[PDB]
Amino acid sequence: RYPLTFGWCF
Amino acid sequence: MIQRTPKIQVYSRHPAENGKSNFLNCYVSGFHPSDIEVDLLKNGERIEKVEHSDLSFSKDWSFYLLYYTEFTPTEKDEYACRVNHVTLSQPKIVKWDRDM
Amino acid sequence: KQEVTQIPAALSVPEGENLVLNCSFTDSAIYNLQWFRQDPGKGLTSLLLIQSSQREQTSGRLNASLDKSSGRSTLYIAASQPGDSATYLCAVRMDSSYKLIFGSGTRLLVRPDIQNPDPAVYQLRDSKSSDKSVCLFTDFDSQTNVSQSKDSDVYITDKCVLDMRSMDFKSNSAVAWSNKSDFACANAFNNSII
Amino acid sequence: GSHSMRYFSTSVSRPGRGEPRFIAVGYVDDTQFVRFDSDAASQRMEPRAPWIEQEGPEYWDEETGKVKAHSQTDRENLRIALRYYNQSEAGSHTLQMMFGCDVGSDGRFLRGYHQYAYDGKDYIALKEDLRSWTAADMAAQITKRKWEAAHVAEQQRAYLEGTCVDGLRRYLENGKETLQRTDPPKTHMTHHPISDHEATLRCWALGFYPAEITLTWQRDGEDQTQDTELVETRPAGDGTFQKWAAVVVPSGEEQRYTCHVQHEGLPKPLTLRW
Amino acid sequence: TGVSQNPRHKITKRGQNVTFRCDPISEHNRLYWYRQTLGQGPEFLTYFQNEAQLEKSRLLSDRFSAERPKGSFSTLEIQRTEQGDSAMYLCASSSWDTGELFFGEGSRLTVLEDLKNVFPPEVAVFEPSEAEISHTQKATLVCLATGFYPDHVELSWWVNGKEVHSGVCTDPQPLKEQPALNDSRYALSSRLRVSATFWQNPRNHFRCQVQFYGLSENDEWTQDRAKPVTQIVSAEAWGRAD
């Protein structure tokens, strides 16, 4: 199950 | 910008047996960046039906790929990998060694 | 097959009551939850967001709790004011998707506490024509309900609350009118009781 | 024993020739189970192990949409990186990410991971406590502060301790026949000249799963690293692994040496002599 | 500041194409489209991360398409509108870290079979009763908007050139003037209550404003009556010591 990407912004 | 040179192993999936169909593997690893040229050779000629694993990497972020092809070994035919990379001034050619 | 249900569908309460707005979902693999407020004809105002990790969240008189195992979320509204009157929407994001999935909402009405009820009907004349007039039913307590019209030529609106803020004064009213010549405001509202 | 789930992603920018190429792969322990390639025709997350084939059409849509979102996230992260390091819009760069979780035999959460690399170098990494960050340079320090201020770690820890664990646990059951299989190494030995004085002994371990293996040489019951060569464990291609260990020995003194093979697929370790 | 949607109202004829626009919150990462019908919850249409349209509802009509060509602003197009398209179209955007959705005002679509019955309101303002003033010392004005067919109206009160909310109360919904009819016109009332002394001052000016949404200026019109375009209609009154 892939994670969501909220909060992954450099 | 760190760049890393490819390490090569050339081998068969199952132990080699003249006349028995097998797989020819070239395992290339520890390189960076991911763009790489890998050919498999039969008596010095490029083999056309060649497939590779999905791009992955190791603990130190260096890449690895497994290039492979179906082959039936004989004791006359030579097999080799030719590997070319941006970190190399000239390609590495690694011959398959049955008895290694 | 995620189903978001909102409990209850609608809610009428006396002002100052502590309110429980429930939301439940059949699939507990939730990333986060979000509560919204909607006012008729208008869009959605964001009220509270609760992340998967968090258990509760508060903003003034609003507290939202979340229980992932239960598949349950409650919105508490403390000291409900007539101004809270709105549709309250529960929405969830799945771990598996970016979209929000909405409930149907809880329709909430918080009835004003009328301190000095003074039910009266009044006739109001047109500012431009002495001929035209409307009926005003005003100053009844919040428990008094106005009934819809059953006569084709007489129109009666639902009740509505005004708040004269500088005077801290809230009152109920409904409006009635006709073009008919046997018009009479007195019995135009003899169809509404406590 | 304990188990892992990892995902490895690679974005490579190519200015003037379209958008970054994004590749992601998923693993359970040593077995690869999914892949996505933004240059491939399907535009779908795809199965790479038989046990994941059980998953329904919605799982494939869900995973497809999430990996394509990552695709987008790293496309933007590359552009940011360029500005942080003040690099030119001309060159190709690589953004790599790794994340996943380990569980113990009980199925309980052991550890989580969430880390980035830019052009082969560490960029930022979630610390073991899953609450704080390690930046490798000045550029990465900007990102660290951004993430600390926004309390981004919480959402990451939530994934690692929940969704990740539930997924791994599920895959382990669905694929127990293989993922919880043990495959013992099949061993043998080769012998090669080298010179007038010495030969090389090569100890082979073949067809074993999982990759984890220990090969050691001994002379007269005493182990030796001194003239020892140990290759990288390598994939056979059928889901199993291969590895060898070699020593250089005086010619005629080969029987003085023994090779030892440890692997959780072995009742008791194996010992080989020429 | 927040999410901006245009047009806020659209009345169209079945078979016509409409376009809606959304301007998300600045540098918000994701933009979402939803659809909402009366007394129902918002239903998902489609979403974008940057300019990538990454998930669209599997029930989405062939006639519906969205795009967000630069990231930033998004476009939703409906081809050959049907009465079933009639709904509130909601745009939202979320931040990179939270995933909290923030919605616009909405774009409200009504698709009519044709435009024969589109009609602006008649507006009147009704003055406070002497008996209310005497009995309560407060003065209620009623505003009445009548005979408008599509139900898109916004009523506001103006007191000495300023919009007022204090003391205002408007029917939550317009009522059908002929409830048994499928194409009934509508009515809408509103009240504005002030103190008696405020009404007794003849300086004080009370304007009821009804913003009606109807035809575009470039929709064709062949009836004799004036083209029932989008327009403001008003009525007004002045205080007085009686």
| CATH code (residue B60) | 2.60.40.10
Which of A1, A4, A8 to substitute to test the interface with C, most C CBs within 10 Å? A4
Give the whole-angstrom CA distance, residue E56 versus residue E110: 23
Contact E50 D152 (CB under 8 A): no
Domains along chain D?
1-181 (3.30.500.10), 182-274 (2.60.40.10)
Bridge partners (DSSP) listed for residue D113: D100
What was the structure determination method? X-ray
Q: Are D196 and D69 in contact (CB under 8 A)?
A: no
Cβ contact A–D (≥3 pairs, < 8 Å): yes
Give the whole-angstrom CA distance, residue C155 versus residue C8: 31
Bridge partners (DSSP) listed for residue E210: E155, E233
Contact A9 D80 (CB under 8 A): yes
Give the whole-angstrom CA distance, residue D4 versus residue B40: 33
Cα separations (Å) of D68 from D99, D119, D165, D180? 16, 22, 22, 30
Q: Counting Cβ atoms within 10 Å, is residue C22 exposed (0-12), middle (13-18) or buried (19+)? A: middle
Q: Which chains touch D (3 or more CB pairs under 8 A)?
A: A, B, C, E
Question: CB pairs under 8 A, 24+ apart, for D219-225?
Answer: D219/D247, D219/D249, D219/D256, D219/D257, D220/D256, D221/D258
Q: Are C5 and C92 in contact (CB under 8 A)?
A: no
Q: Are D217 and D202 in contact (CB under 8 A)?
A: no
Q: Are C45 and C36 in contact (CB under 8 A)?
A: yes
Exposure pattern of E52-66 as b/e (b: 16+ CB <10 Å)?
Answer: bbbbbbeeeeeebeb
Q: Which two tokens stand for residue E106?
A: 């909405």
Q: Which residue has the tokens 């009213």?
A: C173
Helix (H, G, I), strand (E, B) or coil at E238: strand
Show Cβ contacts of residue C97 under 8 Å, excluding neighbours closer than 6 positions. D62, D65, D66, E55
Give one DSSP letter per residue of C84-132, joined into a string: G-EEEEEEEEETT-SS-EE---EEEEEE---SS---EEEEEEBSS-SS-
Q: Which two tokens stand for residue C68?
A: 């992932």
What part of E 185-214 touches C (C-beta under 8 Å)? 187, 189, 191-195
Give the whole-angstrom CA distance, residue D249 versus residue D203: 13
Give the whole-angstrom CA distance, residue C31 versus residue E79: 35
Closest-CA residue of D relative to E50 is D72
Can you give the C-alpha Rg of chain D in angstroms?
23
Identity of the residue in B1, B4, B27 whose CB atom sits nearest the CB atom of D235: B27
> Amino acid letter at E72?
S
Give the whole-angstrom CA distance, residue C47 versus residue C33: 11
Q: What is the largest CA-CA distance in chain D?
A: 69
A vs D, Cβ pairs < 8 A, gives 49
- DSSP class of residue D54? G
Helix (H, G, I), strand (E, B) or coil at D26: strand
Q: Are E68 and E55 in contact (CB under 8 A)?
A: no
Give the whole-angstrom CA distance, residue E31 versus residue E68: 9
Give the whole-angstrom CA distance, residue D24 versus residue E18: 40
Topology classification of domain C113-194: Immunoglobulin-like (2.60.40)
Exposure pattern of D56-83 as b/e (b: 16+ CB <10 Å)?
Answer: eeeebbbbbbbbbbbbbbbbbbbebbbe
Q: Are E160 and E204 in contact (CB under 8 A)?
A: yes
Identity of the residue in D65, D158, D163 whose CB atom sits nearest the CB atom of C51: D158
Give the whole-angstrom CA distance, residue D274 versus residue D227: 17
User: CATH 2.60.40.10 spans which residues of chain C?
Assistant: 1-112, 113-194
Question: CB pairs under 8 A, 24+ apart, for C117-120?
Answer: C117/C141, C118/E135, C118/E136, C119/C144, C120/E131, C120/E132, C120/E135, C120/E136
Q: Which two tokens stand for residue D257?
A: 């040496």
DSSP alpha helix (H) spans, chain E: 130-136, 196-200
Q: Which residue has the tokens 């892992």?
A: D4
Strands C72-77 and C62-67: antiparallel
D164 φ/ψ angles, rounded to the nearest 5 degrees: -60, -50
> Amino acid letter at D14?
R
Bridge partners (DSSP) listed for residue B94: B81
Contact E54 D152 (CB under 8 A): no
Chain B interface includes D119 (CB < 8 A) = yes
How close, in Å, is residue D82 to chain A by CA atoms? 11
Give the whole-angstrom CA distance, residue C166 versus residue E207: 20
Task: Categorise residue D179: left if φ over 0, alpha if ψ from -120 to 50, beta otherwise.
Answer: alpha
Which of C162, C165, C169 to substitute to test the interface with E, most E CBs within 10 Å? C162
Cβ contact B–A (≥3 pairs, < 8 Å): no
Show Cβ contacts of residue D247 under 8 Å, excluding neighbours closer than 6 positions. D200, D201, D217, D219, D224, D227, D228, D229, D257
Q: Which two tokens stand for residue D89?
A: 């819009």
> Amino acid letter at C167?
M
Q: Are B57 and D96 in contact (CB under 8 A)?
A: yes
The dihedral through the CA atoms of E227, E229, E231, E236 has a sign that is positive
Q: Are E160 and C146 in contact (CB under 8 A)?
A: no
Q: Which of D257, D274, D272, D270 is nearest to D221 (CA)?
A: D257
Q: Which residue has the tokens 């390091």?
A: D85
Cβ contact E–C (≥3 pairs, < 8 Å): yes
D155 φ/ψ angles, rounded to the nearest 5 degrees: -65, -35
Q: Which residues of C touch A1 (CB under 8 A)?
A: 95-96
Show Cβ contacts of residue D177 under 8 Å, excluding neighbours closer than 6 positions. D51
Which of D6, D25, D39, D42 to substitute to test the interface with B, most B CBs within 10 Å? D25
Cβ contact B–C (≥3 pairs, < 8 Å): no
Per the document, the length of chain A is: 10
How close, in Å, is residue D39 to chain A by CA atoms? 20
Chain C interface includes A1 (CB < 8 A) = yes
CB atoms closer than 10 angstroms to residue D128: 10
Q: How many CA atoms lie within 13 A of D96 on its CB side?
A: 21
Helix (H, G, I), strand (E, B) or coil at E191: strand
Contact A2 D66 (CB under 8 A): yes
Strands B63-71 and B51-52: antiparallel
Identity of the residue in C93, C105, C177 whose CB atom sits nearest the CB atom of E144: C177
Residue B93's domain spans which residues? 1-100
Q: Are C172 and C112 in contact (CB under 8 A)?
A: yes
How close, in Å, is residue A6 to chain E by CA atoms? 5
How close, in Å, is residue C151 to chain A by CA atoms? 58
Strands D222-223 and E205-212: unpaired
- Helix D138-149 crosses helix D57-84 at what angle (to 10 degrees)? 130
How close, in Å, is residue C126 to chain A by CA atoms? 59
Q: Are C157 and C175 in contact (CB under 8 A)?
A: yes
Show Cβ contacts of residue C124 under 8 Å, excluding neighbours closer than 6 positions. C133, C134, C135, C136, E126, E127, E128, E129, E140, E141, E142
Q: Which chains touch E (3 or more CB pairs under 8 A)?
A: A, C, D
Q: Which residues of B touch D98 (CB under 8 A)?
A: 57
Q: Which two tokens stand for residue D18?
A: 């379209």
Chain centroid offset of residue D77 CA: 23
Identity of the residue in E52, E97, E98 whose CB atom sits nearest the CB atom of D72: E52
Give the whole-angstrom CA distance, residue B9 versus residue B7: 7
Q: Which residues of E touch D71 (CB under 8 A)?
A: 52
Chain D interface includes C29 (CB < 8 A) = yes
Chain B interface includes D231 (CB < 8 A) = yes
What H or E segment, with its residue span, contains residue D60? Answer: helix D57-84
Contact D65 C95 (CB under 8 A): no
Q: Are E146 and E122 in contact (CB under 8 A)?
A: yes
- DSSP class of residue D196? S
Give the whole-angstrom CA distance, residue E63 versus residue E68: 17
Topology classification of domain C1-112: Immunoglobulin-like (2.60.40)
Helix (H, G, I), strand (E, B) or coil at D181: coil
What H or E segment, with its residue span, contains residue D84? Answer: helix D57-84
Q: Are C185 and C135 in contact (CB under 8 A)?
A: yes
Contact D68 E52 (CB under 8 A): yes
Contact C173 E169 (CB under 8 A): yes
Helix (H, G, I), strand (E, B) or coil at D69: helix
Q: Which of C140, C135, C147 is nearest to C119 (CA)?
A: C140
Exposure pattern of C115-143 as b/e (b: 16+ CB <10 Å)?
Answer: eeeebebbbbbbbeeeeebbbbbbbbbbe
Q: Are D35 and B54 in contact (CB under 8 A)?
A: yes
Contact E50 D76 (CB under 8 A): yes
Q: Which of C21, C26, C23, C25 is nearest to C10 (CA)?
A: C21
Q: What is the largest CA-CA distance in chain E?
A: 67
- Residues of E engaging D, defined by a Cβ cutoff of 8 Å: 49-50, 52, 54-55, 97-98
Cα separations (Å) of D92 from B1, B30, B35? 11, 19, 11
Cα separations (Å) of B61 from A3, B24, D25, D53, D123? 21, 26, 14, 29, 11
- DSSP class of residue C18? P
Q: How many CA atoms lie within 13 A of D249 on its CB side?
A: 26
Domains along chain E?
1-113 (2.60.40.10), 114-242 (2.60.40.10)
Show Cβ contacts of residue D214 under 8 Å, excluding neighbours closer than 6 positions. D260, D261, D262, D263
> Amino acid letter at D226?
Q
Q: How many CA atoms lie within 13 A of C42 on its CB side?
A: 13
Q: Which residues of D touch E97 (CB under 8 A)?
A: 150, 152
Chain C interface includes E55 (CB < 8 A) = yes
Per the document, the length of chain B is: 100
Q: Which two tokens stand for residue C87?
A: 């549709």
Contact E44 C122 (CB under 8 A): no
Closest-CA residue of D relative to C51 is D155
Contact D162 C96 (CB under 8 A): no
Q: Which chains touch B (3 or more CB pairs under 8 A)?
A: D
